[PDB]
Amino acid sequence: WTPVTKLGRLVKDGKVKSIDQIFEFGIKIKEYQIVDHLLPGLKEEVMTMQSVQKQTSAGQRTRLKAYVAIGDHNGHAGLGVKCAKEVAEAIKGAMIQAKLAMVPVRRGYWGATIGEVHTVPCKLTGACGSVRVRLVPAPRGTGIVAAPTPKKFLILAGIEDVFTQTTGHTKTLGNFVKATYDAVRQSYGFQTKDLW
Amino acid sequence: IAEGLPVRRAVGSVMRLIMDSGAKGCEVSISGKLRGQRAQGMVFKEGYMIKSGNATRQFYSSAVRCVLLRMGIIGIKVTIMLDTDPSGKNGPAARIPDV
Amino acid sequence: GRMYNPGRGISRRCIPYRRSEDLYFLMRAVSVRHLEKNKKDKDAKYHLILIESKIHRLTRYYKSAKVLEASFKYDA
Amino acid sequence: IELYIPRHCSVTHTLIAADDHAAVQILVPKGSVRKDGISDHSLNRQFQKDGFLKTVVPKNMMI
Amino acid sequence: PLIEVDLLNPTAASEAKAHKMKRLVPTPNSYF
Amino acid sequence: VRVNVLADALKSITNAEKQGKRQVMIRPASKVICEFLNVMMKHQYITDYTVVDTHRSGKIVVNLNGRLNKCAVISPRFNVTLSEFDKWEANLLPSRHFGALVLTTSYGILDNTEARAKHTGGRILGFFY
Amino acid sequence: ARGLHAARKMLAQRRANKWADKEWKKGKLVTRYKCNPLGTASHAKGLVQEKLGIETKQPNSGIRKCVRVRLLKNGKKITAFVPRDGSLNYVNENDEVLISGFGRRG
Amino acid sequence: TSKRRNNGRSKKGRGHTQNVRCSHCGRCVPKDKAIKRYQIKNIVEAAAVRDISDNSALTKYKLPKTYMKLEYCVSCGIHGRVVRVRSRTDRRNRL
RNA sequence: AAAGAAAAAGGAAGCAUUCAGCAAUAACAGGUCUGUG
RNA sequence: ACGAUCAGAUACCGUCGUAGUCCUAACUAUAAACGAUGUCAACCAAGGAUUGGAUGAAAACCUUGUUCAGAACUUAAAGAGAAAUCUUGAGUUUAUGGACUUCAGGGGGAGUAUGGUCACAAGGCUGAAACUUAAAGGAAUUGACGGAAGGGCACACCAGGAGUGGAGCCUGCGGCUUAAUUUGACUC
RNA sequence: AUUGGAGGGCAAGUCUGGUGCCAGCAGCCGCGGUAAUUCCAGCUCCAAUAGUGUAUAUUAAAGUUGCUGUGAUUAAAACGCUCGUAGUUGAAUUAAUUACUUUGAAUAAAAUAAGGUGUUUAAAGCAUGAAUAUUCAAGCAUGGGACAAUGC
RNA sequence: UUGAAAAAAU
């Protein structure tokens, strides 16, 4: 409601129909309400809660930082991080940033061109910090063979069969999901043969 | 609070109710043994609220309450920032009309 | 680059694009063995070891080319 | 099976990333390339091929 | 260099400035 | 010293495409270096090349168009049995429809797509995405 | 040492480099049969000699009731933790007591 | 890790430089690690330069100047206010 | 170029003219359960 | 060895002085022996400047162009890294394979014991275990602290006035006493 | 029909009596110094079920033994530097062995994955016997010589 | 110029 950006007006006035058109031309989603219209019924998921502390001359200003990841199971996913004093706003403020940080996830087959698309098209690794997560195409049988923390994310992104190998300090959930999210962020940047 | 509702919700509703009733700002303070044996205290605020000056006498609406719980006593203080309806303009204000 | 000193020169002759001893010259080892008069010249003693191994490197190769009979041995 | 057919850079013939915000699109009637000063010269190799420029880039640089 | 140039055919001026071994076809700088 | 002339050649091409260069120069040109480029030309990963005659194993100019992703050599050429192809495809290649190995066999230089059909094995030279 | 014909250096390197782990090396030194009071046994039978109480470490406080037990196979002395609350009374002097390790491996 | 890129000294291609003695505490410090300042001072200070000229047996005598080069170490180079502690991004200043 | 600083005259009053009340974010394991229905 | 300072000072400060500091001959072979960064090889963005040559103009030195070797430096919106930082790599690495050698496997025990060997000797090179313990450690953030620096402020001090501390007495506190000499507060 | 637990890893109590850094629980982080989510007890449900805790050893996790697959500025770790034998690795070029590679032959059963077969299913069993494929390392004969080692 | 120390755990 009441947009202020050029893209926000067109989506409100029903001039843009599909979200992928915005992604196709590199346009930047500057408002979260845009995602609330193009992709209704977005599943919500909050991976974990971390309390960060800043030491001051009087005490320790404890604040809560929330990581959430949203996206329908059809092939769209995002992740945002926000910290504030109150736990209620930390999830609420993470709703906006996760919506602003959605990226299109490309999926393909493993051995044969049989409907429908289930797994990643090729091998990608998330260029996170010390954590490096590698995604491998998987046959129709095995599900998401992954740790519980990225398994929650990969369900939202829509992938149903994948193989993962985790390297680094995986106990850090802040970088575990951001390694997978960065792995799926570049899914469309890898130029395969069919995209020539 | 006597009903057992959490401070994060029961106070928030009232603290929202005053907000849309034309009040510039509100201050709610809760202290006691709400969480554990060790005492705690939280102060909620919305909007604009000045604290120093004579205007704190002609613009405040304060009230102090104490609610006895199963474990101890909890103190509640509510201060409301009034608006221009209690006629009288604040110190710093220009509001220059334009022709 | 050079075998022993870490210097990397690329100066060369360039035979143009148209078609129209080394062992003996290293026996420098004799000239250094100057060593008798200056027995404390530890820098010439080290440089003589490099030259001695250079000759002991062409000897090992020239023998496999049958240029020198396998009885060749370098002694001062 | 494809969400969208991705764009392509007309200077280096490689795919345009989904979130490469430094990319442009010039209509006359990639991000990493722009941030090195090559976008000015690389376009000249591309403008002169279609003829919008006549004698700006020497013939020994046009590949 | 960053400014790519044609190297399969080099300019006559740029050939005479390069090192004699670094040309497309190394040629001597000597006469006679 | 120069141990593998193919190893230094492929890394030159891989680094050139990462910088968006239009053509790169490889000073030495062995038989396998020219043959390897022929395998990558059937897949249209490069347009064409040339072999300058310098009387000292002349240079090669490779014309590429932003298509080669990673061409690499493989450390001492392992004996790839025909039954062992599946071991290397699942590791060295990104997907079952994208990568292309390169092998050397007695019938000449061949890629994994065609060497399986010819029913032969041998050593392995490298790969390219 | 990547060369195709260098399969002796790589194997010799691993044989040399494998001796530096603190866990597998314990499985090849002859010390389990020599210095370990248990040896390779799951349980050790012994005899009670002394009742002792070890105070806990710095953060904690209190006295942990224990017994000094002399084995029947080696004769060595080992301090044993009496299991439960008030269970030091159940044990007596010169009686068969079973001793079997702890949670931490060995 | 490395507080300085050149490790405080100013030697790159040499493995040894002769020591010098600090002018304040007499502490053996390397030639490049030392703090070198060149002082030019008249023997007669400005408060007394005109006093000589009133009574000088010569006619056009120009008072000379003292030429001493002082080398300090870090311990009394900082203590002597010759140099000070600088900001992390202001350390690279070399003018 | 400026926020400003200083002298003198006038002015009842030219250091924010002088003296005062309210006086934020966060904290003490500060005192009072011997002030209280 | 005296003389200072200090509670002590067997040290920093001052004075004196054997070994040593110097050369020769023969030993010892360790250092923060450091760029804490092994050796050779291919690619590698922009820029100023320097040492030694070759080639032109300007007629040995000085200004300038091309190029080879060398010690370095500035920028990077790029590459890497956990970060500091690195770019003449610490880049071309989960998209993992250019060739070779050495070293390391949580912290102590401990470079200790025993064994072997070298040295006139001190010592060096090779060199574990028994046992003990949930941490040891690396780069950066905030705060606090500095007998660290820079910039400002306060009867904080300088120039002073009044004093208190000294005397008698009112009162409070500690102590002693008592059946009780009721108790909270203990630097600002 | 029991075992173990109900602070986190890991499912489960913001239930009531005592103990007051003492008894004690705790594989690890820890919980207890008078208001215990962990102790001794009373009530309840959490996982498994003829099963379940305990101690030791094997494997995976361990990309913490690393050919596939590690790190070496600062966390542990580049010999002080150079010379040098064994070893490893060695630039392009040609229109007799060995290695490599494709095939066969022969190759104990049991077993590994199974072809077939309603022991009522299944574990079983072979009541047509699957061609059953197996042989890593070696060895025998054979089509090819790109990459390779041997010197005229 | 001199300037040392602050019992263990919450």
Swiss-Prot record, chain E:
Compartments where located: Cytoplasm
On subunit structure and binding partners, the annotation says: Component of the small ribosomal subunit.
Say which domain of life the source belongs to.
Eukaryota
- Protein name (record): Small ribosomal subunit protein eS27
Which family is this sequence assigned to? Belongs to the eukaryotic ribosomal protein eS27 family.
Which residues form each disulfide bond in the chain?
A: none
> Could you say which residues of the full protein are shown?
2 to 33 of 84
Q: Which organism is it from?
A: Entamoeba histolytica (strain ATCC 30459 / HM-1:IMSS / ABRM)
User: What is the annotated role of this protein in its UniProt record?
Assistant: Component of the small ribosomal subunit. The ribosome is a large ribonucleoprotein complex responsible for the synthesis of proteins in the cell. Required for proper rRNA processing and maturation of 18S rRNAs.
